[PDB]
Amino acid sequence: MENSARQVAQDTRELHLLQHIKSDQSYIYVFVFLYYRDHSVRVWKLTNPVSISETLDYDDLINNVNRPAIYYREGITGNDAGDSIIDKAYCEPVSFMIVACGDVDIQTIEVNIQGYDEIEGVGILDSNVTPPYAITATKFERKTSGGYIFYTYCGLFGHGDRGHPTMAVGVEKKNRNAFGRMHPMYVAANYKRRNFWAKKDWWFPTEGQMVEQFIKQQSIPYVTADNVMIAPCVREIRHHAHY
Amino acid sequence: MENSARQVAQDTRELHLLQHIKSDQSYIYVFVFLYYRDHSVRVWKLTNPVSISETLDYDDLINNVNRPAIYYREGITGNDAGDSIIDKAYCEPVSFMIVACGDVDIQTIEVNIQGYDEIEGVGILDSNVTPPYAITATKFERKTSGGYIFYTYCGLFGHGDRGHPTMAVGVEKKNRNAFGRMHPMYVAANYKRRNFWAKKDWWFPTEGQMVEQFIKQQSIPYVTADNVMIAPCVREIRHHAHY
Amino acid sequence: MENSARQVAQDTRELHLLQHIKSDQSYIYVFVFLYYRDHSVRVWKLTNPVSISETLDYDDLINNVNRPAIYYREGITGNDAGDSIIDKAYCEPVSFMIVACGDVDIQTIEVNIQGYDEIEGVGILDSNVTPPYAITATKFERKTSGGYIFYTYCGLFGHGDRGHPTMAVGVEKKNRNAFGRMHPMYVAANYKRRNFWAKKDWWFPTEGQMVEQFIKQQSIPYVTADNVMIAPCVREIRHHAHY
Ligand SMILES: Nc1nc2c(ncn2[C@@H]2O[C@H](COP(=O)(O)OP(=O)(O)OP(=O)(O)O)[C@@H](O)[C@H]2O)c(=O)[nH]1
Ligand SMILES: Nc1nc2c(ncn2[C@@H]2O[C@H](COP(=O)(O)OP(=O)(O)OP(=O)(O)O)[C@@H](O)[C@H]2O)c(=O)[nH]1
Ligand SMILES: Nc1nc2c(ncn2[C@@H]2O[C@H](COP(=O)(O)OP(=O)(O)OP(=O)(O)O)[C@@H](O)[C@H]2O)c(=O)[nH]1
Ligand SMILES: [Mg+2]
Numbered sequence: 001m002e003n004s005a006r007q008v009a010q011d012t013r014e015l016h017l018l019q020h021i022k023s024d025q026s027y028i029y030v031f032v033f034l035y036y037r038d039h040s041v042r043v044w045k046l047t048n049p050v051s052i053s054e055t056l057d058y059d060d061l062i063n064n065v066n067r068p069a070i071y072y073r074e075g076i077t078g079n080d081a082g083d084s085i086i087d088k089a090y091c092e093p094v095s096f097m098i099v100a101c102g103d104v105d106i107q108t109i110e111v112n113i114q115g116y117d118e119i120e121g122v123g124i125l126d127s128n129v130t131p132p133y134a135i136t137a138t139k140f141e142r143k144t145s146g147g148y149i150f151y152t153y154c155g156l157f158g159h160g161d162r163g164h165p166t167m168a169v170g171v172e173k174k175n176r177n178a179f180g181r182m183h184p185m186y187v188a189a190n191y192k193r194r195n196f197w198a199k200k201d202w203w204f205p206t207e208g209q210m211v212e213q214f215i216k217q218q219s220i221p222y223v224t225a226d227n228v229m230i231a232p233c234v235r236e237i238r239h240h241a242h243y
Numbered sequence: 244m245e246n247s248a249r250q251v252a253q254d255t256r257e258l259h260l261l262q263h264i265k266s267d268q269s270y271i272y273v274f275v276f277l278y279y280r281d282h283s284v285r286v287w288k289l290t291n292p293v294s295i296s297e298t299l300d301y302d303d304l305i306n307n308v309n310r311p312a313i314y315y316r317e318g319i320t321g322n323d324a325g326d327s328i329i330d331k332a333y334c335e336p337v338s339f340m341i342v343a344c345g346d347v348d349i350q351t352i353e354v355n356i357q358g359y360d361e362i363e364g365v366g367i368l369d370s371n372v373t374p375p376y377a378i379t380a381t382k383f384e385r386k387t388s389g390g391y392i393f394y395t396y397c398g399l400f401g402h403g404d405r406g407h408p409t410m411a412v413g414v415e416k417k418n419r420n421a422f423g424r425m426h427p428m429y430v431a432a433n434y435k436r437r438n439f440w441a442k443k444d445w446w447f448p449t450e451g452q453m454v455e456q457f458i459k460q461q462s463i464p465y466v467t468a469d470n471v472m473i474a475p476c477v478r479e480i481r482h483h484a485h486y
Numbered sequence: 487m488e489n490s491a492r493q494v495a496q497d498t499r500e501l502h503l504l505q506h507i508k509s510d511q512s513y514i515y516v517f518v519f520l521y522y523r524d525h526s527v528r529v530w531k532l533t534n535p536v537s538i539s540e541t542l543d544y545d546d547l548i549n550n551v552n553r554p555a556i557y558y559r560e561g562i563t564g565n566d567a568g569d570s571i572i573d574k575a576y577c578e579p580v581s582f583m584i585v586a587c588g589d590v591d592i593q594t595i596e597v598n599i600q601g602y603d604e605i606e607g608v609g610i611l612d613s614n615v616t617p618p619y620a621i622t623a624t625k626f627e628r629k630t631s632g633g634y635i636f637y638t639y640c641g642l643f644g645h646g647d648r649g650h651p652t653m654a655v656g657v658e659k660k661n662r663n664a665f666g667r668m669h670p671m672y673v674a675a676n677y678k679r680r681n682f683w684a685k686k687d688w689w690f691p692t693e694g695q696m697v698e699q700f701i702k703q704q705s706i707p708y709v710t711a712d713n714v715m716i717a718p719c720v721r722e723i724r725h726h727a728h729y
């Protein structure tokens with residue numbers, strides 16, 4: 001029964017699943033999960049065939065389901081410039097998790113969290129494009145699920161400037177060989193796909209409900225707050241030893 | 244009178260119009276028309292000097308003139324996860340037409356319509372960047388108006404997953420020769436123009452009113468519901484036979 | 487005291503500030519200031535490590551703090567197609583200033599202001615990608631503040647088509663040598679940063695308040711309405727004569 005052609009069709013499907021990761025036919029993904037004090041989750045999907053580059057602005061990072069604005073916004077724009085009796089908005093996120101999956105090269109990831117104005121450092125002419133805390137690759141945890149590999153990074157936004165967050169996120173698809181996905185003979189085909197797809201969001205009342213209704217349904221790699229991995233698992237198939 | 248310099252000035256204008264298509268000085272365009280049950284039309288202009296790449300998200304595809312939301316949105320996010328007494332929103336589009344015009348290379352077009360979550364296939368790790376139905380080039384109809392050529396593709400969204408649509412659209416400007424518009428000596432000049440222009444929309448109470456007030460006024464190639472071509476026409480001018 | 491190591495640490499900081507402009511580690515910026523009849527200012531930050539490309543649509547250019555819409559919008563979409571008793575919205579901007587700063591190559595800037603439909607010229611097939619008024623480089627004023635250089639361009643929107651404005655803005659970082667920032671060995675690293683950062687806006691009740699709470703606080707080069715330069719100043723340091 002193990003060598004039945006029907007089983008080999010199943011083997012084909014599973015070899016396809018693992019090889020599809022490395023193939024040019026798959027997308028890379030970064031999912032940004034935002035956890036609020038009401039226990040709800042806002043989720044952003046960032047995705048591209050070869051290159052993810054996105055800003056999540058303040059309005060993308062606050063809870064837009066359990067929600068004049070300028071009175072508060074002016075106070076997070078300039079020091080002591082507010083006219084609000086509310087010091088910190090309830091709907092600012094408590095914590096985040098970044099899940100990088102598909103064929104990401106984690107060594108190329110950047111997660112650059114700033115305050116409301118997006119300006120690193122003391123003034124715009126002194127801002128660095130890559131502050132040290134944006135070089136997050138080595139702080140991701142490498143998770144495995146069978147032959148699948150994904151990466152997680154989680155943290156707290158806090159009660160300071162980054163409690164009114166903006167975030168720039170970018171990552172490249174891993175290229176294990178030398179022909180660049182932006183080499184002149186390829187560039188125009190990938191440039192045509194620079195916005196496949198624009199950032200997309202959803203909201204869920206709790207993490208447990210999101211796991212059942214979205215994480216499992218879309219087979220998105222994930223780790224819950226209690227540190228349980230929720231991910232599809234494709235066991236490795238190979239006819240010969242691997243180094 | 245036919246060889247009067249004034250007539251030759253007119254000839255210059257019309258030769259200019261046809262040659263401007265192929266020139267680097269013109270834009271390419273994809274117009275996405277969305278037709279609603281109330282007979283109104285929402286229109287997106289997608290445009291670039293050399294490379295169009297855009298996502299139209301759900302909120303871009305529903306009727307935003309003849310209009311809590313999460314009760315419904317949750318039900319199109321996950322299976323059986325809704326809390327809405329409304330099964331299908333009235334403002335979801337009935338049908339679409341894609342008009343590709345200017346110097347598009349129709350062979351490079353992709354029109355990838357997904358459901359609300361934008362995720363092709365059974366799970367994110369198995370999604371294909373190019374599902375077969377996105378390779379729409381050969382399904383466009385080639386329309387001519389004098390020396391102008393444009394392409395149309397129309398269809399129905401339906402009452403299933405794509406009745407809650409998202410769409411990725413991309414196309415390149417035709418290059419009849421070998422120097423790429425993203426070749427190293429050109430790339431930075433076109434990259435600077437990657438967002439010339441961001442997607443732009445309008446709305447019109449009926450197709451007939453849109454034809455008079457917008458299609459004709461902007462000289463946009465178009466085909467009405469009764470299959471009438473509305474397009475400028477520049478008759479070909481040449482001093483010698485053409486193969 | 488002038489050669490104390492503490493003073494040399496200060497010299498290092500100031501040499502760093504000037505050299506950081508030319509370094510790949512800094513961003514380029516275009517700030518778009520929009521001045522309304524109520525004396526308030528809406529401000530857009532456009533920024534990238536190497537290449538700025540942005541559209542500011544109509545809704546980005548009107549005053550969104552001191553604020554059915556289609557009755558008016560239809561009248562700026564098509565000629566005589568409106569159904570509004572209001573001929574011109576109060577919240578359309580009176581004037582603009584463009585500040586280009588950081589290591590911009592001003593020779594690569596374009597500021598292309600159109601009316602509401604974004605369509606240059608008489609029809610879409612005749613639109614030019616670069617109308618003459620978009621080639622604004624030589625109309626910028628070159629301002630200096632010590633070793634810092636920045637560029638300003640200001641003007642009026644008016645009471646015609648451009649009184650309902652849209653704008654495309656793009657500029658490249660100056661490259662004083664031959665290795666392109668989009669050369670094949672660099673392109674993928676900068677493409678990953680194409681949306682670092684998406685356009686970001688703020689609003690301020692008056693120019694004077696914005697100067698104290700934002701221009702000074704972020705050390706953004708600026709010129710007030712009375713023609714006063716507000717900018718950080720780093721005096722030049724060099725051990726030898728300069729041509
Ligand atoms: N968690 C919390 N902090 C509050 C509350 N009310 C006031 N605060 C204070 O506001 C402070 C904001 O400044 P920080 O000390 O930087 O707080 P933080 O970002 O959590 O701390 P760091 O880890 O040092 O960055 C917090 O430390 C709290 O002490 C509250 O209701 N909850
Ligand atoms: N057109 C229409 N369909 C309705 C209505 N109410 C319920 N439905 C049903 O809802 C169904 C949704 O599933 P499908 O069978 O996939 O409909 P569809 O997308 O138009 O059909 P396909 O062409 O096969 O994709 C439709 O087929 C209708 O039978 C209605 O008011 N109008
Ligand atoms: N400034 C101003 N103009 C008004 C007002 N009411 C009507 N208008 C007129 O509306 C006209 C709009 O057309 P234009 O002549 O092109 O005005 P403009 O854009 O300022 O002038 P140009 O510099 O020639 O482009 C203005 O010239 C005014 O004469 C008003 O309250 N204020
Ligand atoms: Mg903190």
Ligand SMILES: [Mg+2]
Nearest residue numbers: 400401402403
């Ligand atoms: Mg259907």
Ligand SMILES: [Mg+2]
Nearest residue numbers: 643644645646
């Ligand atoms: Mg005018």
